[PDB]
Amino acid sequence: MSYYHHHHHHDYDIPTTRPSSGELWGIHLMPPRILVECLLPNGMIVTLECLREATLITIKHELFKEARKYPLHQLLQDESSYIFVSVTQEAEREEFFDETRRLCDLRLFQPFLKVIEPVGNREEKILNREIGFAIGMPVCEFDMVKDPEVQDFRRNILNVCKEAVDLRDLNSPHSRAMYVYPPNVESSPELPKHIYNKLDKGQIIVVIWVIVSPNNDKQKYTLKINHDCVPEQVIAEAIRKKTRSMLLSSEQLKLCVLEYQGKYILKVCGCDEYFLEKYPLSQYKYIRSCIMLGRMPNLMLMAKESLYSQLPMDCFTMPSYSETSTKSLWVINSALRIKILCATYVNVNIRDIDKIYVRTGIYHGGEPLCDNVNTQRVPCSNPRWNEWLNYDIYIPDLPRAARLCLSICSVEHCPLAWGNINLFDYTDTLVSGKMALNLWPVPHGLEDLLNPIGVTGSNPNKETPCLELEFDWFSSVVKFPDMSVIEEHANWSVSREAGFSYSHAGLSDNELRENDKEQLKAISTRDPLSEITEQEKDFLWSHRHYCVTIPEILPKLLLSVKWNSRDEVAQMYCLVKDWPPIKPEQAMELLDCNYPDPMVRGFAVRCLEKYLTDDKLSQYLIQLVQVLKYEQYLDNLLVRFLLKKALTNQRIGHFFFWHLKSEMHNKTVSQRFGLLLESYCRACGMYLKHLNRQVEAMEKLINLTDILKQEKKDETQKVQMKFLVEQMRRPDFMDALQGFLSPLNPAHQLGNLRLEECRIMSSAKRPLWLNWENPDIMSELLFQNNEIIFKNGDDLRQDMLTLQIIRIMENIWQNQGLDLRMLPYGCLSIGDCVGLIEVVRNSHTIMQIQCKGGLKGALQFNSHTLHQWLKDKNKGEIYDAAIDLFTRSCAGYCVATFILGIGDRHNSNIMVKDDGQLFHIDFGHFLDHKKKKFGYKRERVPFVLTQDFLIVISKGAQECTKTREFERFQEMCYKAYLAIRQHANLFINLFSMMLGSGMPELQSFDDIAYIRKTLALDKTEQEALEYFMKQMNDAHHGGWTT
Amino acid sequence: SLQDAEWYWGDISREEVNEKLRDTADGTFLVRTKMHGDYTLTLRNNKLIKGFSDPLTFSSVVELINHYRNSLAQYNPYPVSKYQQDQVVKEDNIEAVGKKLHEYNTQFQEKSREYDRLYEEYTRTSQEIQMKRTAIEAFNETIKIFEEQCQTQERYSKEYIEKNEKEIQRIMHNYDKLKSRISEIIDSRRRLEEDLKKQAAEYREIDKRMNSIKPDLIQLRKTRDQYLMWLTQKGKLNEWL
Ligand SMILES: CCCC(=O)OC[C@H](COP(=O)(O)O[C@@H]1[C@H](O)[C@H](O)[C@@H](OP(=O)(O)O)[C@H](OP(=O)(O)O)[C@H]1O)OC(=O)CCC
Ligand SMILES: CCCC(=O)OC[C@H](COP(=O)(O)O[C@@H]1[C@H](O)[C@H](O)[C@@H](OP(=O)(O)O)[C@H](OP(=O)(O)O)[C@H]1O)OC(=O)CCC
């Protein structure tokens, strides 16, 4: 299970036993001999002929033997007394302290170096060139940031950093060991019935290995223990097997198990996973894999000191960058004026289009006023308006999270570029004065007029359409009301609402609510996409005080406030205050784009703060990371919660770094997500050094495929390969691609590369199939070798989200009792269309299965050869055994598949493993995003079981539509579709948080809306079952009832 | 009157409705479990209303509609359903209307293909432009360094030439290897710039033909959901797509 390439041992019974930034500007990968101009401190260039791969140690060394031959020598002193400097790619003069870097690894721009003595004495604080290399933009580029919000985020966040660095060093060394090597642990300790059941009433055989002296010598101790006994107990009874001699009294045996006992801790054989705290043994994901797969766990007895040896200190430093009370917003006595002045740089065919006019609105997720335009005046050629816009909404009634949203349009109506501006700045001031906003180009999806789903801020581009605005002036700067000055408003409203007698819509001591209006626990239960009616909104608003009882109703209630009504909003604040904390699977909608208010989102965090575990968090990390775009300012409560988690658990730290860095190139977030990374990298301790090295390889790997794809394709694989190899022999590469942690799962060390096992795959996109040796001493016992694929040219983000949506479905079913076995192989987007794809060993494409066997005269596929091939690889009950898996997984990758409406499952994106497990690869585009052109209704069946697959499901005989094994199946599918249907909210909420991404199959809630048809949410389960069966019955051309 | 009703699109659940409400403006109306109730009005962002309240003098589904097609200011703080008669070029074949569908649908497909070709070139060109902006400055920095150098060359040179004869020569030499090289680099930074502003140009020619070929890709789009709709009002629609 990423542990064993998901490989079931079937006989095993437990009972019966910057881009284009090659090495040099333009160049790519730099030529093998290269001349370097070395500018001296005596003002003389001397040109060294240097090998591509030489270290600045050899170069410094050669240069000062060679100046010896140019005029003015005595005017220089010993090398020892100088450092190399040059202009890098990112155009910043880098001092080169590490003098062991290679001439090819520096990213130089032009091939020249300069000699200086290094002033800046804190040679220490300039190790943070690291921090810059780790993020791919250089820290000093932040000290160049004028804007005061960013420069404030940089200082304020340091709180969190010292919090983490503190909360770690708490019970050193154990607490720092708990930091680096956090127990990998399933969520329920309660096992599920079908798993417990492979255990002869709950007992695992486990093999503990031990190291005494050489020690290239080993010792097995096969314990058989209660399934739920904490690592300590296991180490206890382990050392018991070890010692018991004929010369040891029983009493003095027990004594020795007391002393020795806890000087050791349990490590997983073959990777850097340790079992460092109490958990029932079956809770660690490893054991519970090993059980699932018919495996004997192998643990290794670890000297606890020898571990505390392997980590040393992270050693934090606080970094180098270490008008009165204003006027209450609620005093401003007028509507909102907004003046659109001119616009600069629209590019259109003056003949091809009628006119253009600026379209604006004020929004809060969905607007609070009568949206408005502005006369179609000066079209096209140099376009000015001087209009003020009269928005009907009083200024005291603007929400905190309220926002101007504009766009330039063409008439015939059509949007050209859009922009959204935050009507309040972070310190709480109501925007005034000039703003030159900088618009975004309208995307794929949206063929609407405005864009409130979009991001708030100016697009950074000298060459985009700049539109220039003026917000009203109020002779004092204006701040949004104090958190108290609102709780005084509520109390008023409430004492006011208690003294009327006519009734209207908000037709609200003791209220008449009795029973019948238990339509409230009804609304409650409906999913998010499913809209709230007018009445329902008023209805809810009118029983707001009741809702507290059904607290998970909030996500609706909120939508029911009129957000342009301080009275309503001022009260909705006081409820949020003492609203019951709620379960994460539903506090997480509160962070999607429909809830932009700070108090709301603050609560959503307080909820997480409370419930979400360190494991549920790594399960939903993307959703969390991604959702950040919808936070209004830089320093917000979510950012702060996440960061603290990142710095407390280095395995969340890992995937927090990458997820952020993946989008590093994406203009909408580059700013936000750089600063946050500068934060992580400064406080995560030693790990930063480990990340530099992953980062160091992924670059060499980018710049290698980048040469293969451009000028180098057209030559036969054979030629291309004997280049790829030529190139990884390079010293600089062997070095950079060999001693690091797998970015796919950092517990997996990558040792020496093994080239004969490396190769370019067949795909157009030239993937690199790479293979590393496991340099664990117990390599053997897990996987001696270790391979991953590196693909450059596919937005992986999608494959990644599906694979995350498969992993969730699985846990759901299983972690409930219901055993379908999906194999969501691992996948990591590490850049702009550059990702790592995990390799399932022993899989095959249906195509090959059919191609490995089946007659001579190549005259047409034998529909039985899948079965056959399996029935070769598995004789025995090892047969009955492999079919159950094939049946159990086939049913899974079917429901999931129908639900997420992924790409067609034609005959070579379905794979079969030797133990009989089938799974998908290459999910095209999910959510049937090929109804973009047509797809009206369809609700297509992507996986459709041909005769082929059916034969295998019904062990053999003809007429498979009608056996029992088939019913068994069917009855699996029903159970599995209905199970997902019970959790739909989570699944919508999941895709909802994704809208934030640049993924073009996720543009707007209507994109998500598919799921709500697939899952038949508008109906009763009873009906859904039938809709589902029918749907199967139909692509399957009949026979799917009784 | 209720079946025909013009805006009573029938069974069309929440999603057929919303994807027939996307892109019409204000004024737009149209009517749609029984643990919930009966029919829904869906105006326009989307406003669902379930008489609506106590003053139900009914008298019909339709007697309700023409007082609020005459409105809804007075209970809470435009048919757009026009029976696909308008255009759909009155081609009354059930099949000429159908094959036509395909004819605009390949055309829509054709444009999305030229469109996305363009969306990506822009995004590429943007990034080549910025990469050309911090090159232009990686050049400017390079020269700053060389200037700084070749001056410190003269600071120390005209300070060791109180001299005797050899040296004199072979100092001026490398000093003059240096100032040609300064020119040589400068040769490069105008050149890059001339390609920069060459690209800065053709960048516009993309935003031009994007916002030139967006008008189409909504109209051509629109009339399709117009034609496509006259089929499902009377009549498998897979083949023409
Ligand atoms: C006879 C020589 C044989 C040979 O092996 O030659 C191999 C290498 C040179 O590498 P290349 O891949 O041929 O060069 C790239 C392509 O030709 C591409 O067409 C071009 O585009 P454009 O210039 O048209 O834009 C690239 O420009 P940039 O944008 O990267 O500057 C260019 O760099 O020299 C050596 O390493 C050994 C010689 C010391
Ligand atoms: C810059 C030019 C873009 C381009 O044309 O590039 C051609 C290829 C790279 O593949 P792609 O186009 O990026 O990818 C396309 C999608 O996978 C799509 O799903 C599929 O449609 P379907 O038939 O599966 O539904 C397309 O089929 P055709 O488009 O081949 O018919 C497929 O090509 O490079 C080469 O090797 C060129 C060799 C001449």
CATH of the domain at B227: 1.10.287.1490
Tokens of A327: 């006027």
Find the CB nearest A71 among B119, B170, B232: B170
- Strands of A834-838's sheet, edge to edge? A759-760, A768-773, A785-792, A834-838, A827-829
Q: Residue B215 and residue A412: Cβ atoms within 8 Å?
A: yes
Nearest C-alpha to atom 6 of ligand 1 is from which residue?
A: A31
CB atoms within 10 A of CB A514: 7
- Closest atom of ligand 1 to A28 CA is 30
Q: Which of A563, A95, A654, A92 is nearest to A363 (CA)?
A: A563
CA distance A301 to A240: 13
Indicate which of B24, B160, B186, B211 best probes the interface with A, i.e. most A CBs within 10 Å of its own CB.
Answer: B211
Structure token pair of residue A713: 């394709």
Say yes or no: B21 and B108 in one domain. no
B219 and B130, same domain (yes or no):
yes
A18/B131 CB distance under 8 A: yes
Q: Calculate how close chain B gets to A72, using CA atoms only, in Å.
A: 8
CA nearest to A404, candidates A443, A458, A447, A342: A458
Q: Report CB contact under 8 Å: B145, A93.
A: yes
In angstroms, rounded to a whole number, what is the distance separating the alpha carbons of residues A824 and B197?
48
- Give a yes or no: residue A610 inside a domain: yes
Judge contact between A129 and A94, C-beta under 8 A.
yes
Spatial contact of A407 and A451, defined as CB atoms under 8 Å apart: yes
Do A77 and A130 lie in a common domain?
A: no
Residue A30 Cα to ligand 1 midpoint, Å, equals 10
Range of the domain at A773: 685-841
CA distances from residue B138 to A17, A39, A86 in whole angstroms, order as listed: 70, 17, 10
Return the residue matching tokens 């990112």.
Answer: A90
Nearest CA in chain A to B24: A448
Query: Looking at the structure, do residues A726 and A706 belong to the same domain, yes or no?
Result: yes
A460: its two tokens: 């950074």
Method used to obtain the model? X-ray
What end-to-end distance do the CA atoms of chain A give, in Å?
Answer: 36
Which of A347, A412, A533 minimises the CB distance to B50?
A533
Are A504 and A625 part of one and the same domain? yes
In chain A, the residue whose alpha carbon lies closest to the alpha carbon of B168 is: A71
Helical pair A637-648 and A158-168, crossing angle rounded to 10 deg: 30
The closest of B39, B27, B45, B40 to B82, measured between CA atoms, is B27
Vertex A144 angle, CA A141 and A150, to 5° = 90
Q: Token pair for residue A763?
A: 């795909």
What is the DSSP-derived secondary structure letter of residue A1003?
S
Same domain assignment for residues B76 and B144: no
Both B63 and B126 in one domain: the answer is no
* CA of A358 relative to ligand 2 center, distance in Å: 39
Determine whether the interchain pair B156/A1013 forms a contact, defined as Cβ–Cβ distance below 8 Å: no
Radius of gyration of chain B (CA): 35
Query: In chain A, what residues touch B203 (CB-CB under 8 Å)?
Result: 463
Structure tokens at A818: 């219901």
Distance CA A182, CA A167 (A): 14
Which chain A positions have a beta carbon within 8 Å of B40's beta carbon?
Answer: 533
- A827, A706: one domain: yes
Residue A208: what residue type?
Answer: I
d(CA A177, CA A277) in angstroms, rounded, equals 11
Tell me which residue in A39, A462, A1019 faces B145 most closely, judged by beta carbons: A39
Identify the CATH number of the domain in which residue A968 sits. Answer: 1.10.1070.11
Separation of alpha carbons A716 and A728, rounded Å? 19
From the list A610, A637, A998, the residue with the least C-alpha distance to A833 is A998
CB B140 within 8 A of CB B185: no
Chain-centroid distance, C-alpha A647: 17
Angle at which helices A566-577 and A484-497 cross, to 10°? 110
Kind of pairing, strands A93-96 and A219-226? unpaired
Q: A441: helix, coil or strand?
A: strand
Of B91, B123, B145, which residue constitutes the final position of a domain? Answer: B91
Ligand 1: atom nearest CA of A712 is 12
Distant-in-sequence, close-in-space partners of A699: CB < 8 Å, separation ≥ 6: none
B195 exposure class (CB count in 10 Å sphere: 0-12, 13-18, 19+): exposed
Same domain flag for B159 and B176: yes
Q: Are B210 and B122 in contact (CB under 8 A)?
A: yes
What is the count of structural domains for chain B?
Answer: 2
Distance A64 CA to ligand 2 centre (A): 55
Provide the token pair at B60.
């019909």
Name the residue of chain B whose CA is nearest to A114's CA: B145
Contact call for residues A423 and A361 (beta carbons, < 8 A): no
- Picking from A20, A110, A1013, the nearest residue to B142 by CB comes out as A110
Q: Pocket of ligand 1, candidates A23, A24, A27: which has the most ligand atoms within 8 Å of its Cβ, to mutate? A: A27
Nearest residue (by CA) to ligand 1, atom 25, is A26
Which of A634, A664, A684 is the C-terminal boundary of a domain? A684
* Domain contains A58: yes
What residue owns the CA closest to ligand 1's atom 34?
Answer: A31
Q: Does residue A295 share a domain with residue A181?
A: yes
Breaks (C-N over 2.5 A) in chain A follow: 17, 322, 411, 508
CA A32 to each of CA A49, A86, A512, B130: distance values in angstroms, whole numbers, following the listed order: 10, 20, 86, 29
Cβ neighbours of residue A76 closer than 8 Å, sequence gap 6 or more: A40, A41, A42, A64, A67
Whole-number Å distance between alpha carbons of A743 and A682: 20
Nearest CA in chain B to A111: B142
Radius of gyration of chain A (CA): 32
Question: How many whole angstroms separate alpha carbon A527 and alpha carbon A980?
Answer: 13
Tokens of A4: 């064993």
B219/B189 same-domain check: yes
Report the C-alpha gap between A1002 and A992 in whole angstroms: 9
Residues B186 and B138 in one domain: yes
Residues of A in contact with B46 (CB under 8 A): 531
Q: H or E stretch including A30?
A: none
Whole-number Cα distances in Å, A565 to A61, A74, A393, A571, A677: 74, 80, 9, 10, 39
Verify whether the Cβ–Cβ distance A45 to B177 is below 8 Å: yes
User: Residue A74 burial (CB < 10 Å; 0-12/13-18/19+)?
Assistant: exposed
Closest CA to A635 of A930, A426, A415, A328: A426
Q: Residue B13 and residue B30: Cα distance in Å, rounded?
A: 12
Q: For residue B90, give both structure tokens.
A: 């009155």
Token reading at A658: 């990458």
- A1002: phi then psi, degrees, rounded to nearest 5: -130, 75
Nearest chain A CA: its distance from B69 CA (Å):
18
What is the Cα–Cα distance from A744 to A747, expressed in whole angstroms?
A: 9
Inter-residue contact A510 to A532 (CB < 8 Å): no
Q: Are residue B120 and residue B19 in the same domain, yes or no?
A: no
Q: Has residue A995 been placed in a domain? A: yes
How many angstroms separate the first and last alpha carbons of chain B? 34
Cβ atoms of A972 and A813 closer than 8 Å: no
Pocket of ligand 1 (CB under 6 A): A 26-28, 31, 711
Which ligand places an atom closest to the C-alpha of A714? 2
| Pair (A301, A247) in one structural domain | yes
Handedness of CA A41, A45, A50, A53 (dihedral sign): positive
Long-range CB contacts (within 8 A, 24+) of A236-245: A236/A261, A238/A208, A238/A210, A238/A301, A239/A264, A242/A210
| Same structural domain, B77 and B180 | no
* Residue A317 forms part of a structural domain: no
Please provide the size of chain A in residues. 1042
Tell me the three-class secondary structure of A622-638, residue by residue. Answer: HHHHHHHHHCCCCCCHH
Helices (H) and strands (E) in chain A, counts: 37, 27
Look at residues A426, A507, A494, A436 and name the one whose alpha carbon lies nearest to residue A465: A436
Span from the CA of A764 to the centroid of ligand 2 (angstroms): 9
How far, in Å, are A235, A393, A581, A835, B125 from residue A299 at the CA level?
10, 67, 40, 32, 54
Nearest CA to ligand 1 atom 16: A711
Query: Could you tell me the two tokens for A179?
Result: 């930091």
Q: Of all residues in chain A, what percent are helix, strand and coil, respectively (each to 5)? A: 40, 15, 45
Q: A1042 lies in a domain?
A: yes
User: Smallest Cβ distance to B171: which of A71, A353, A410?
Assistant: A71
For A89, what's the count of Cα atoms within 13 Å in the CB-facing half-sphere? 21
Instruction: Map residue A1005 onto helix, strand or coil.
Output: helix
What does DSSP say about strands A910-913 and A918-920: parallel, antiparallel, or unpaired?
Answer: antiparallel
- Tell me which residue of A904, A660, A645, A922 sits closest to A800, measured CA to CA: A922
Report the number of distinct structural domains present in chain A.
6
Count of C-beta atoms within a 10 Å radius of residue A763? 12
Query: What are the residues facing A980 on neighbouring strands?
Result: none
For B19, nearest residue in chain A (alpha carbons): A1006
Q: Flag if A1018 and B48 touch (Cβ within 8 Å).
A: no
Kindly list the residues from chain B whose CB atom is less than 8 angstroms away from the CB atom of residue A448: 22-23
Residue A799's nearest CA partner among A824, A817, A780 is A824
Instruction: Give dist(CA A1004, CA A994) in Å, integer.
Output: 10
Helix axes A637-648, A598-610, angle to 10 degrees: 20
Distance A27 CA to ligand 1 centre (A): 7
Name which residue sits closest to atom 22 of ligand 1, judged by CA.
A26
Same domain, B98 and B23: no
Residues in chain A closer than 8 A to B22 (CB atoms): 447-448, 1006
Position A321 in a domain: no
- The C-alpha atoms of residue A579 and residue A558 are separated, in whole angstroms, by 12
B230 with B138, same domain? yes
List CB contacts (< 8 A) between B142 and chain A: 87, 109-110, 112
Same domain, A94 and A143: no
Structure tokens at B200: 């800065």
Q: Look up residue A593 and give its DSSP letter.
A: T
* A36 phi-psi bin (left φ>0, alpha ψ -120 to 50, beta other): beta
Contact B22 A43 (CB under 8 A): no
Candidates B229, B33, B8; CA nearest to A519 is B33
Sheet containing A918-920: order of strands? A843-845, A910-913, A918-920
Tokens of A207: 């093999």
Quickly tell me which residue has 């333009």 as its tokens.
A26
Pairing of strands A112-116, A33-39: parallel
Report if residue A315 sits inside a domain.
no
Interface contact flag, A114 B149, Cβ < 8 Å: yes
Q: What's the distance, CA A986 to chain centroid?
A: 17
Please, how many CA atoms are within 13 Å of residue A772, restricted to the half-sphere of its CB? 22
Residues 6 or more apart in contact with residue B168 via CB below 8 angstroms: B161
A109 in Cβ contact with A21 (< 8 Å): no
Say yes or no: A708 and A833 in one domain: yes
Q: For tokens 């999906």, what's the residue?
A: A822
* Alpha-carbon torsion (A866, A872, A873, A877), positive or negative: positive
CB pair distance less than 8 Å for A45 and B237: no
Q: Are residues A156 and A208 in the same domain?
A: no
Instruction: Check: CB of residue A215 under 8 Å from CB of residue A306.
Output: no
A639 and A769 fall within a common domain: no
Burial class (CB in 10 A: 0-12, 13-18, 19+), A410: buried
| Interface contact A531-B112, CB threshold 8 A | no
B39, B152: one domain: no
**A413 within domain boundaries:** yes
Beta bridge partners of A828: A836
Say if the Cβ atoms of B22 and A448 lie within 8 Å: yes
Check: CB of residue A84 under 8 Å from CB of residue A63.
no
Give residue A58's identity as a one-letter amino acid code: T
**How many whole angstroms separate alpha carbon A946 and alpha carbon A918?**
14
CB-based contact A220:A208 (threshold 8 Å): yes
A902 and A1007 share a domain?
yes
Identify the residue among A534, A927, A932, A1003 best suited for mutation to test binding to B, counting B beta carbons within 10 A and taking the highest: A534
Element (H, E) at A437: strand A433-438
DSSP A759: E
For every residue of chain B, DSSP letters joined together read -TTT-SSB-TT--HHHHHTTTTT--TT---B--TTT-S--EE-----EE---SS------SHHHHTTS---TTTT-------TT-SSGGG-TTSSHHHHHHHHHHHHHHHHHHHHHHHHHHHHHHHHHHHHHHHHHHHHHHHHHHHHHHHHHHHHHHTTT----HHHHHHHHHHHHHHHHHHHHHHHHHHHHHHHHHHHHHHHHHHHHHHTTSHHHHHHHHHHHHHHHHHHHHH--TTTT-
Mutation pick for ligand 1 pocket among A709, A711, A715, A723 (CB with most ligand atoms within 8 Å): A711
Total number of residues shown for chain B: 241
Structure tokens at A876: 């025995």
Q: Provide the domain limits for residue B127.
A: 92-241
Q: Burial code of A684-720, b = ≥16 C-beta within 10 A, e = fewer? A: bbbbbebbebbbbbbbbbbbbbbbbeeeeeeeeeeeb
**Do residues A668 and A690 both lie within one domain?**
no
**CA pair distance A129, A140, nearest whole angstrom:** 9
Domain boundary among B40, B75, B91: B91
Residue A704 phi/psi, 5° resolution? -90, -60
Q: Considering only the beta carbons, identify the residue of B47, B129, B212 that sits closest to A352.
A: B212
Distance from CA of A397 to the nearest CA of B (A): 14
In the reported structure, the alpha carbon of residue B125 is separated from the centroid of ligand 2 by a whole-number distance in angstroms of 21
What is the residue type of A848?
A: Q
Tokens found for residue A292: 């699932």
Nearby residues of A490 by Cβ (< 8 Å), 6 or more positions away: A570, A571, A573, A574
Which residue has its alpha carbon closest to ligand 1 atom 31? Answer: A26
C-alpha span between A226 and A883 (Å, rounded) = 30
Nearest to A948 by CA among A849, A832, A826, A859: A849
**Pocket mutation for ligand 1, best pick of A28, A29, A104, A706 (most atoms within 8 Å of C-beta):** A28
